[PDB]
Amino acid sequence: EAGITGTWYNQLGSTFIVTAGADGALTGTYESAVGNAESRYVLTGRYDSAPATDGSGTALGWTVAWKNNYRNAHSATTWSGQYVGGAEARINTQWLLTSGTTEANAWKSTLVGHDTFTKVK
Amino acid sequence: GITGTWYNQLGSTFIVTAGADGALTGTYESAVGNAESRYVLTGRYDSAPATDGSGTALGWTVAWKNNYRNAHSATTWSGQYVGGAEARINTQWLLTSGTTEANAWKSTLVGHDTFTKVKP
Amino acid sequence: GITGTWYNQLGSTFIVTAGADGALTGTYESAVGNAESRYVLTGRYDSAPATDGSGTALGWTVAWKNNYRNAHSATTWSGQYVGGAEARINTQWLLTSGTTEANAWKSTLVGHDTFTKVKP
Amino acid sequence: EAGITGTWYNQLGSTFIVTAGADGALTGTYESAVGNAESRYVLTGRYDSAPATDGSGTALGWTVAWKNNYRNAHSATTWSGQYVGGAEARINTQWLLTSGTTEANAWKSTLVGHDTFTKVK
Ligand SMILES: O=C(O)CCCC[C@@H]1SC[C@@H]2NC(=O)N[C@@H]21
Ligand SMILES: O=C(O)CCCC[C@@H]1SC[C@@H]2NC(=O)N[C@@H]21
Ligand SMILES: O=C(O)CCCC[C@@H]1SC[C@@H]2NC(=O)N[C@@H]21
Ligand SMILES: O=C(O)CCCC[C@@H]1SC[C@@H]2NC(=O)N[C@@H]21
């Protein structure tokens, strides 16, 4: 929550600005350094608002649909991962990027990858 | 349309509203796993899909905490809606559990769910 | 058993021999993608599965180069064999294309294939 | 081929010993630092034996079934990725680890992750 809330950057140079709400909500904006994308996009997600206290990360995920008021890529990414708190906080993720496709092309609709986010100030 | 009550091959129930500008908001009830009753979900979808026959890209997240249980985990589904006589949402998902750093290699399950509006 | 000729939901043909000590060896012919004719495959399976009803874990790889084409890519399938009257192999797969470093983020497709011995 | 052939170690401390054959074969052994595993396991896979020369990686993949003459985990991992050659050669991968399960448990059969291998000498 204060931990998650803030500005984060990944290894590609993308920017993630997020607010973690007391109810488990994540809201913010995402700017991707790569792909069919420009400017900021809405993100929404959820996190474990009462995580384990036993040295485990805090599970979370969020989605961006790659449509904003400037571009539409007809695609959406979800990130699933965990926040690791502390003075060098990290969010470690795997992601799935699905493009809208025709039925015949659905087998090649989804890319998979991994992003590591570092918190800035 | 996307709005409605959906069921996957496990018998889970996905109740969702698609807002006009791209929001997905609803609840998820899983038939399996460390889960009971409904959980909050939020996500996004392409609110102006292509007009060539392509599906509508979407995704959503559930954190597996509600008033009954907390599994200290979260699932994201990424996929596309395919309209038509038997509308479908085809997805792949990632379920990440909170882990220690040394166990992070085994933190994330992957799978695939297909949803229709047909009730079991 | 695992040995035989299998077909997935795309109509691809997977011909495989399961060696007694865990080898998988065969050929794969994809119905889709940058592919024509048969490609070599190799993999491994659990040659002494559990005796509790569980499936048999397995995986295999195809590099998409043969005498006809080279897509500069490789797919791995990871999954389990489920015996019975209608034997099945349920898999998830990763298709990695060779890319530059800057494009590595978009190098890998993920999907899921289910195989049976029923010919289209 | 000479490039791929050798000993490699990942971020977990696992050991990958591989030979790349002229026909596109990969053969060798894998020792995992983690999980239900001990000693070396057979691996087999394939690689693009005539890759692009345009600054792209060489696509490859391999499988380990986690049975050897000392332990059986009833599971198998596949790694899919690319070799990036040069004086600091790397193999960058994503992987899928499937466990044998009952039908009711099949939804939780498969773990996903990513490993980066560094070549040693
Ligand atoms: O090309 C598209 O369809 C839209 C942009 C997708 C960019 C992705 S999302 C996963 C990865 N992480 C990033 O920061 N950018 C890419
Ligand atoms: O066990 C947990 O950590 C929480 C429940 C997870 C259930 C999952 S989410 C992906 C899959 N699809 C479902 O409908 N249920 C399972
Ligand atoms: O286009 C390529 O790079 C080579 C062909 C890939 C075809 C894939 S592999 C996963 C999926 N299952 C199949 O039977 N065919 C596609
Ligand atoms: O626990 C098991 O079922 C067997 C061992 C699996 C270990 C895996 S494979 C992917 C990852 N990379 C490694 O080097 N070790 C783990």
Layout of helices and strands, plus pairs?
Four copies of one chain form a homotetramer.
Chain A: E1 6-10, E2 15-20, E3 25-31, E4 41-47, E5 58-67, E6 72-84, E7 90-99, E8 110-119
Antiparallel strand pairs in A: 1-2, 1-8, 2-3, 3-4, 4-5, 5-6, 6-7, 7-8
Keywords (chains B, C): Biotin, Secreted, Signal
GO molecular function (chains B, C): biotin binding
Domain Avidin-like (chains B, C): 1-120
Task: Walk me through what this model shows.
4 copies of one chain form a homotetramer. Chain A has 121 residues and is mainly β. The first copy, chain A, has a single domain (1-121), classed as Lipocalin, CATH 2.40.128.30. Chain A has no helices and 8 strands. An 8-stranded antiparallel barrel of chain A has the order 1-2-3-4-5-6-7-8. In chain A, a hairpin with a 4-residue loop joins strand 2 and strand 3 (25-31). The two termini of chain A are 15 Å apart. Chain A binds chain C through residues 12, 34-35, 96, 104, 107-113, and chain C through 10, 32-33, 94-95, 102, 105-106, 108-111. The complex binds biotin (4 copies). The site of one biotin has 17 residues of chain D, from strand 6, strand 7 and strand 8.
